[PDB]
UniProtKB/Swiss-Prot annotation, chain A:
Function comment: Subunit of the fusion protein that is processed upon entry into the host cell. Mediates fusion of the virion and cellular membranes by functioning as a class I viral fusion protein. Contains a viral fusion peptide that is unmasked after S2 cleavage. This cleavage can occur at the cell membrane by host TMPRSS2 or during endocytosis by host CSTL. In either case, this triggers an extensive and irreversible conformational change that leads to fusion of the viral envelope with the cellular cytoplasmic membrane, releasing viral genomic RNA into the host cell cytoplasm.
Native source species: Severe acute respiratory syndrome coronavirus 2 (2019-nCoV)
Source taxonomy: Viruses, Riboviria, Orthornavirae, Pisuviricota, Pisoniviricetes
Domain of life: Viruses
Name assigned to this protein: Spike protein S2'
Effect listed in the UniProt record for changing F33L: In strain: Eta/B.1.525
UniProtKB/Swiss-Prot annotation, chain C:
Impact noted for substituting E51K: In strain: Theta/P.3
Function: Subunit of the fusion protein that is processed upon entry into the host cell. Mediates fusion of the virion and cellular membranes by functioning as a class I viral fusion protein. Contains a viral fusion peptide that is unmasked after S2 cleavage. This cleavage can occur at the cell membrane by host TMPRSS2 or during endocytosis by host CSTL. In either case, this triggers an extensive and irreversible conformational change that leads to fusion of the viral envelope with the cellular cytoplasmic membrane, releasing viral genomic RNA into the host cell cytoplasm.
Effect of Q30H: In strain: Kappa/B.1.617.1
Superkingdom, taxonomy of origin: Viruses
Annotated disulfide bonds: C41-C85
Organism: Severe acute respiratory syndrome coronavirus 2 (2019-nCoV)
Name of the featured protein: Spike protein S2'
Outcome (variant: D77H): In strain: Alpha/B.1.1.7
Residues represented out of the complete protein: 1042 to 1147 of 1273
Known glycosylation sites: N33, N57, N93
From Swiss-Prot, chain D:
Annotated consequence of substituting N20K: In strain: Omicron/BA.1, Omicron/BA.2, Omicron/BA.2.12.1, Omicron/BA.2.75, Omicron/BA.4, Omicron/BA.5, Omicron/BQ.1.1, Omicron/XBB.1.5, Omicron/EG.5.1
The name this protein goes by in its record: Spike protein S2
Top-level taxon: Viruses
Function comment: Precursor of the fusion protein processed in the biosynthesis of the S protein and the formation of virus particle. Mediates fusion of the virion and cellular membranes by functioning as a class I viral fusion protein. Contains two viral fusion peptides that are unmasked after cleavage. The S2/S2' cleavage occurs during virus entry at the cell membrane by host TMPRSS2 or during endocytosis by host CSTL.
Origin species: Severe acute respiratory syndrome coronavirus 2
Taxonomic lineage from the root: Viruses, Riboviria, Orthornavirae, Pisuviricota, Pisoniviricetes
Residues included from the entire protein: 745 to 794 of 1273
Amino acid sequence: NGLTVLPPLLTDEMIAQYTSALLAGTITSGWTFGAGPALQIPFPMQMAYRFNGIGVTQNVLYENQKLIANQFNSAIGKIQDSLSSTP
Amino acid sequence: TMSLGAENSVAYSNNSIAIPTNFTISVTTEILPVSMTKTSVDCTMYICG
Amino acid sequence: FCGKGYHLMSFPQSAPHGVVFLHVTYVPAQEKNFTTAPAICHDGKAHFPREGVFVSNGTHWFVTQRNFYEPQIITTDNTFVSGNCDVVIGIVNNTVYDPLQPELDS
Amino acid sequence: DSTECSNLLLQYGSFCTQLNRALTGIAVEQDKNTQEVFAQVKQIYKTPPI
Ligand SMILES: *[C@@H]1O[C@H](CO)[C@@H](O[C@@H]2O[C@H](CO)[C@@H](O)[C@H](O)[C@H]2NC(C)=O)[C@H](O)[C@H]1NC(C)=O
Ligand SMILES: *[C@@H]1O[C@H](CO)[C@@H](O[C@@H]2O[C@H](CO)[C@@H](O)[C@H](O)[C@H]2NC(C)=O)[C@H](O)[C@H]1NC(C)=O
Ligand SMILES: *[C@@H]1O[C@H](CO)[C@@H](O[C@@H]2O[C@H](CO)[C@@H](O)[C@H](O)[C@H]2NC(C)=O)[C@H](O)[C@H]1NC(C)=O
Ligand SMILES: *[C@@H]1O[C@H](CO)[C@@H](O[C@@H]2O[C@H](CO)[C@@H](O)[C@H](O)[C@H]2NC(C)=O)[C@H](O)[C@H]1NC(C)=O
Ligand SMILES: *[C@@H]1O[C@H](CO)[C@@H](O)[C@H](O)[C@H]1NC(C)=O
């Protein structure tokens, strides 16, 4: 009766590709790609920089790196379980 | 099909960092509307003259 | 929020029913690869950069600020000591200079 | 598809043009919203294979 649904300009795979590019930039380069050229940095070193941003020394991140990685992986898994288990 | 952008594989490794040796002072423009035209309509004069 | 890049300052300009912000930002450029390490092992102690990052040009280790390449000698004044070398993953062996060491020697 | 109804609808003026223009503005605004949220990088970065 005269109603039409126009498709979005960006399809779901291209929006997913944009999110993938953002994830790759924030993983391989930290915040450098958002302010200019993407500068590579190891991810523990990037996490240490983020630790300094919140006022915690780098040594705390490096000494407890396995624990921090395990906690991060567990939290990401809990996020997937919580999304899969909550309607 | 529209290209999202140029591919840029960042050369990530566990012991390599990229440090800038120079800088660019970049000035960019941001245009923001603030106000509109203040219009008043006499309802009696518009409908009835 | 105030332009692309690290924001330095901004300048307002009036416009018809609007405002134009000239955002002056700092953009890094001419980046160079370096070999990096989280910490420096010296005398059984782990040294971490106080404000910068450890970089290596291939043979020598330096400490530099993170947003501009300015290599400096790794001393006890720009590093801090926390723990031994057994815990940090990827720690490398390099000397750490002491500024007080030539003073008591002479 | 009634011609008589459209002829009577033309007596009300440009209401239909206004409604179509507003809906078109909403439709382009949604694409602008998606561009503003997701298209903030002009480089397609990729993770390393390892
Ligand atoms: C840092 O080193 C990496 C690898 O040694 C460089 O990345 C290569 O760059 C060339 C030139 O564009 C490409 O053809 C290769 O495919 C890249 N390799 C990888 C693994 O990405 C990188 O360019 C160097 N950085 C700088 C600033 O010179
Ligand atoms: C850092 O970049 C600036 C440009 O932003 C370089 O200055 C240029 O240097 C070349 C050759 O030395 C001159 O021909 C240009 O006229 C300069 N441009 C400006 C705007 O001054 C500068 O040399 C670079 N520094 C380093 C160490 O690479
Ligand atoms: C890494 O940087 C150091 C510091 O500049 C370089 O060592 C100097 O190299 C020059 C040229 O060979 C010599 O004249 C100096 O006497 C060296 N200084 C010291 C303290 O050794 C070193 O050559 C650089 N290495 C690379 C691979 O670029
Ligand atoms: C960094 O230095 C430490 C100590 O100077 C080295 O550890 C020694 O390694 C040798 C050979 O593996 C052993 O025989 C010694 O018993 C170790 N001593 C200690 C106190 O651990 C270490 O190998 C060096 N690392 C590198 C890459 O050269
Ligand atoms: C970095 O990776 C290399 C091999 O790619 C490995 O030999 C080395 O131990 C790694 N270092 C760290 C700190 O993970």
